[PDB]
Amino acid sequence: GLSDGEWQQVLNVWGKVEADIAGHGQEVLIRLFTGHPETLEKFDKFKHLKTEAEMKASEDLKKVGTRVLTALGGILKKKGHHEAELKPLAQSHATKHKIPIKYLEFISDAIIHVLHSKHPGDFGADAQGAMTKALELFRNDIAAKYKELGFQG
Numbered sequence: 001g002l003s004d005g006e007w008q009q010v011l012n013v014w015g016k017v018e019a020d021i022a023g024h025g026q027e028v029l030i031r032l033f034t035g036h037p038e039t040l041e042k043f044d045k046f047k048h049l050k051t052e053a054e055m056k057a058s059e060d061l062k063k064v065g066t067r068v069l070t071a072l073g074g075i076l077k078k079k080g081h082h083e084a085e086l087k088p089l090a091q092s093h094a095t096k097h098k099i100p101i102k103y104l105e106f107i108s109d110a111i112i113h114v115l116h117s118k119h120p121g122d123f124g125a126d127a128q129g130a131m132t133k134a135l136e137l138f139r140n141d142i143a144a145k146y147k148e149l150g151f152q153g
Ligand code: HEM
Pocket: 039, 040, 042, 043, 044, 067, 068, 069, 071, 072, 089, 092, 093, 096, 097, 099, 103, 104, 107, 108
């Protein structure tokens, strides 16, 4: 699904995120909210924010971005064997807060963009390819739980 070497390329670049979960989390969310303003409408706590200066100063947004990349790192490090980690994630993105699968695609794109901007010597062509497939797998498995939970994502 991913080869062992693709997982290695994923885990390597991810190691670089661990040195600043929070800074990365902010840059991913700013990239997401700026490329795709409608996604910001999903976060009741900071949906009123308008500009990037405001996003950068939000503690709530920073905390959300830390929680996203913390939960994703846990899932990636399972290297595909992530049924347990995915279960609560699917339940929360499909019930109270309904996150379209398309929005997981937007945030995937934003993660890939930030890793490339920040860690390019750790994220060449094949490594971007691998990360792209690892995120596709994550969304695919999430969409499958969406169905069981009665959310057409
Ligand atoms: C890599 C993709 C993502 C990951 C790993 C992720 C992870 C998480 C985690 C750990 C939580 C806290 C779970 C909890 O509240 O019990 C959460 C909650 C939430 N997320 Fe995400 N998230 C992702 C994508 C998104 C996107 C793209 C959006 C909106 C566009 C979003 C919107 C929300 C909202 C509204 C909540 C609160 C849900 C609740 O009250 O339980 N998430 N996410």
